[PDB]
Amino acid sequence: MPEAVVIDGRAVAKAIQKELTEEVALLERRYKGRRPGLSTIICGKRKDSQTYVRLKRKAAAACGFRNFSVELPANVTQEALEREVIRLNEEEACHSIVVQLPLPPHIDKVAALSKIKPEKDADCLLPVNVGQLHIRERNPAIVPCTASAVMELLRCSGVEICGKRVVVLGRGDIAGLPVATLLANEDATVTVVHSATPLCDIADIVRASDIVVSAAGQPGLVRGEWIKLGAAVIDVGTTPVADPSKVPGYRLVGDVCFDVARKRAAYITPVPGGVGPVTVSMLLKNTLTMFKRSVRA
Amino acid sequence: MPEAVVIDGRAVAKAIQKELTEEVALLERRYKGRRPGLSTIICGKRKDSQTYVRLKRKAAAACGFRNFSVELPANVTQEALEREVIRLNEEEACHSIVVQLPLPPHIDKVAALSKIKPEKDADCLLPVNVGQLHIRERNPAIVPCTASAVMELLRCSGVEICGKRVVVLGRGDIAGLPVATLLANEDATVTVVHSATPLCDIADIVRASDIVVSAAGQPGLVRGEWIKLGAAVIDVGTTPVADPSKVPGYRLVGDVCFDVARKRAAYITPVPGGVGPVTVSMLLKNTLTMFKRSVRA
Ligand SMILES: NC(=O)c1ccc[n+]([C@@H]2O[C@H](COP(=O)([O-])OP(=O)(O)OC[C@H]3O[C@@H](n4cnc5c(N)ncnc54)[C@H](OP(=O)(O)O)[C@@H]3O)[C@@H](O)[C@H]2O)c1
Ligand SMILES: Nc1nc(N)c(NC(=O)Nc2ccc(C(=O)N[C@@H](CCC(=O)O)C(=O)O)cc2)c(=O)[nH]1
Ligand SMILES: Nc1nc(N)c(NC(=O)Nc2ccc(C(=O)N[C@@H](CCC(=O)O)C(=O)O)cc2)c(=O)[nH]1
């Protein structure tokens, strides 16, 4: 029987990173010695955050980037965190700064993020940068990495977006929020819903949607039987779920009931191995774009 | 024979303005003469635009503000427009700048608005200020005027928003776009319809909606029959429709088929007399907030 095409995010990331690597080796030869510099700051020891930072550094290193890795304690003072951001602002060879979220509760997140120099805001977390996405008459320099990865996976699918009904579940600053904007810019009719939105409404909305982007962080939220036949389903959820057989005691589970959804969708992405690897690749893309902009002098 | 409550925008707007007037009076004593300065720039002679700026200036004067009224010709060049904006950026006595839309078609709207100094952006049109709107944990200073007026009227009516089904028709930068953002921050289920949405889908979406906010500028777009029994209906449409009995040769007509919708809805706004007057009030509120920020220096 027909079933959804499972889009392989690892292969998509691989191809992107192959092209980035060759681009860097060319640029270095053109700009005697220069190369993109990525900074990642992690506070505390959440195992999932540790994993994602390690993967970013590893990818960056593989593509010929330089890494500026910072690790701070759960304890970190507002001042110590901001001083570290500022240090990276003045480092010429650092073109991107990533502050891995979530931050510890006691930190003022907005304050701290606001210290990042706009030209180095690789996550597109700053108002001056996120406030650009809605301008369709201009193409924005930076787009948040997760949102960007979703759009890249839709591009890979090749599904039409204009005139289509889209549901985005969740409204996270680097995922749900920016992606709804980017989908509407492509002339989709976008509905936004939340994990705790009444289920009867979510079901009704998903049933009518040509494209599903789930970024609510709630495993099994999107029932397979709600999926409209031939829909494209992009699963951004990456929620830790207890599994004593795995290295950190949990597995990552997506928002979508994939086993049922794959029988109805035209396209679907798996978790792990879908949006996540491409999210890392988009950070490297933003960073190379920022590198090139700064080198135009 | 039972019917919607018709929300009285003029009365809301007057309540807000009596508050602003007191506030200005005390600040003028505190800061020995200083007062909020509002500049309104109009290009050309659209009768509706002329009316709206005249109402803004009149309300500003009544609340004790200083007006910087600028009139430019319909054939104003991009440079002369931007030069005027720049002049107002450098004027210490000016705290808010409004560039009345729509601009003449030869004018690049985005480039022109981009010259406004961020702290004087009265309409909250610039990326740095659009970019703060989602930040709930802070209370931003500047709020888009039409959008905040819509929220104000909903609040006045006691209407629930969190978890309700909301449809916004239109996505223009003055009305549709920010309205949708503000309603989404309330964790409403928000669908945005626009010109690429097929009409049949519009009808279905409106029928399922607890709150309808129409900012398309198309008279008669929202059929009364589509309105869910008990819904709240906010008409942001203000289209000039020919009527030679009226002073400018036109009357203002809303997006909503009001006479039919009034029999089904629980709350509705009239056009005129609804969102319009409150939009003006919210401009003055912004302007007073921007003044207060400015004089902390
Ligand atoms: N001109 C004035 O003096 C003035 C000033 C303020 C407010 N208003 C009123 O408030 C409204 C706000 O609009 P705006 O000034 O922010 O910009 P605008 O360009 O008038 O916005 C119109 C929006 O409605 C959409 N739309 C238009 N016709 C439609 C239809 N038949 N079906 C579905 N969607 C439709 C457009 O879609 P696309 O994005 O696909 O084009 C656009 O997003 C105006 O339409 C007007 O009635 C008027
Ligand atoms: N500042 C900032 N904070 C954030 N929290 C994010 N999210 C942010 O990095 N997410 C993310 C999610 C998944 C993966 C990933 O590659 N996951 C692998 C598997 C992970 C694993 O091995 O457990 C996969 O899904 O295939 C990488 C990054 C971000 O992009 N920027
Ligand atoms: N930059 C910019 N451009 C814009 N086009 C707007 N909109 C922008 O001023 N709208 C507006 C709409 C209605 C009224 C208003 O008071 N209308 C009266 C009718 C007045 C009359 O026609 O006599 C009413 O609805 O009751 C005032 C302002 C704006 O806020 N900023």
Phi, psi of B271 (to 5 degrees): -130, 115
Q: Alpha-carbon distance B187 to B165, whole Å?
A: 10
Tell me the nearest-neighbour CA distance from A14 into chain B, angstroms: 33
**Whole-number CA gyration radius for chain A:** 19
As to burial, measured by CB atoms within 10 angstroms (0-12 exposed, 13-18 middle, 19+ buried), residue B38 is buried
Contact yes or no for B127 and A126 at CB 8 A: no
How many C-beta atoms lie closer than 10 Å to residue A244's C-beta? Answer: 6
Helix (H) or strand (E) segment spanning residue B37: strand B37-43
Task: For A234-291, give the DSSP string.
Answer: EE---EEEE-TTSTTSEEEE-SB-HHHHTTT-SEE--SSSSHHHHHHHHHHHHHHHHH
Fold of B31-117: Rossmann fold (3.40.50)
Contact yes or no for A129 and B129 at CB 8 A: no
Kindly give the number of the ligand 1 atom that is closest to the alpha carbon of B52: 3
Please give the structure tokens belonging to residue A126. 């700053």
Q: Alpha-carbon distance B70 to B109, whole Å?
A: 17
**Residue whose tokens read 């980035």:** A20
Give, for ligand 3, the residue of B121, B279, B282 to mutate: max count of ligand atoms closer than 8 Å to Cβ.
B279
The beta strand positions in A133-275, using DSSP E, are: 165-169, 189-193, 211-214, 232-235, 239-242, 250-253, 267-268
Strands B250-253 and B239-242: antiparallel
Residue boundaries of the structural domains of chain B: 1-7+144-276, 31-117
As to burial, measured by CB atoms within 10 angstroms (0-12 exposed, 13-18 middle, 19+ buried), residue A6 is middle
B174 is in an annotated binding site: yes
Instruction: Note whether B281 and B12 are within 8 A (CB).
Output: yes
Pocket of ligand 3 (CB under 6 A): B 51-52, 55, 98-101, 123, 145-146, 174, 238, 252, 272-273, 276-277, 279-280
Q: Alpha-carbon distance A209 to A205, whole Å?
A: 6
Please give the structure tokens belonging to residue A16. 């992107």
Task: For B51-117, give the DSSP string.
Answer: HHHHHHHHHHHHTTPEEEEEEE-TT--HHHHHHHHHHHHH-TT--EEEEPSSPPTTS-HHHHHTTS-
Give, for ligand 2, the residue of A54, A81, A279, A281 to mutate: max count of ligand atoms closer than 8 Å to Cβ.
A279
Q: Alpha-carbon distance B201 to A205, whole Å?
A: 12
Tell me the nearest-neighbour CA distance from B127 into chain A, angstroms: 4
Question: Three-state SS for A15?
Answer: helix
| Method used to solve the structure | X-ray
Q: Check if A1-7+144-276 and A31-117 are the same fold.
A: yes
Q: Alpha-carbon distance B110 to B247, whole Å?
A: 33
Phi, psi of A115 (to 5 degrees): -85, -15
Instruction: Note whether B80 and B56 are within 8 A (CB).
Output: no
Helix (H) or strand (E) segment spanning residue A184: helix A176-185
Fold of B1-7+144-276: Rossmann fold (3.40.50)
Pocket of ligand 1 (CB under 6 A): B 48-49, 52, 102, 169-176, 193-197, 215-218, 221, 236-239
Instruction: Note whether B66 and B92 are within 8 A (CB).
Output: no
> Which residue, A85, A123, A132, A92, is CA-closest to A107?
A85
Contact yes or no for A135 and B129 at CB 8 A: no
> Which residue, A277, A266, A291, is CA-closest to A142?
A291
Instruction: Note whether B169 and B215 are within 8 A (CB).
Output: yes
Question: Three-state SS for B47?
Answer: helix
Closest protein CA for atom 4 of ligand 3: B101
Instruction: Note whether A176 and A221 are within 8 A (CB).
Output: no
The one-letter code for the residue type at A148 is: S
Q: Alpha-carbon distance B290 to B297, whole Å?
A: 12
